[PDB]
Amino acid sequence: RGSHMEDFVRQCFNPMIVELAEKAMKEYGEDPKIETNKFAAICTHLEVCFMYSDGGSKHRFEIIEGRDRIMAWTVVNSICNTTGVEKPKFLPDLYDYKENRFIEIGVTRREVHIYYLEKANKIKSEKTHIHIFSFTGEEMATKADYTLDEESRARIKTRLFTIRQEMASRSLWDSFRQSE
């Protein structure tokens, strides 16, 4: 039972992102052939995390997302024993060596405001920095400190809106939007 959205995902994102997304879904027990909207969302989040880590200086960001659970926890252990940063309750997506904080990247189809709240009660880890992006182009970050400069965030926002368009021209957006 192969969907249009599954085939759109595979052509839309690059093969390394797709395969990491597949690994992640199967690891948590989900099927990208069936949970296709989730498939699309994991790839999007992954790509955003990668573009984010690319926006800084060379060795600025450690990438936690996209790794298998054990190795992701391993590097945060090491980050924590190297920095004395508090061990987060849940896996963050990045670590910032310049500002010395873990980052949780959010990608939402609803209001920046609502999702940001859900993400802060969900972690309660006072330490980790939160950065939300939406498919319509808005962002909110902890303490209004958006970490990267403006052109890097704008690149991410542009790609998000392109994903939205390519979906909509395939009549796939409405189903994707009401899935979250």
Ligand X SMILES: O=C(NCCS(=O)(=O)c1ccccc1)c1nc([C@@H]2CCCN2C(=O)CSc2ccccc2Cl)[nH]c(=O)c1O
Which residues are annotated as part of the binding site for Mn(2+)? 45, 65, 93, 104-105
The residue ranges that bind Mn ion (CB under 5 A) are: 65, 93, 105
Q: Please state, in angstroms and rounded to a whole number, the distance separating the CA atoms of residues 92 and 89.
A: 9
In the residue annotation, 87 being an active-site residue is answered as no
| Number of C-beta neighbours around residue 110 at 10 A | 13
Whose Cβ is closer to ligand X: residue 126's or residue 151's?
126
The residue ranges that bind ligand X (CB under 6 A) are: 24-25, 28, 30, 38, 42, 45, 65, 90-91, 93, 106
Comparing CA positions, the residue from 155, 145, 47 lying closest to residue 100 is 145
Burial class of residue 30 (count of CB atoms within 10 Å of its CB; 0-12, 13-18, 19+): middle
Of residues 23, 89, 119, 127, which has the active-site annotation? 119
Select the binding partner of residue 42 from Mn ion, ligand X, none (C-beta < 5 to 8 A, by kind): ligand X
Annotated catalytic residues are 119
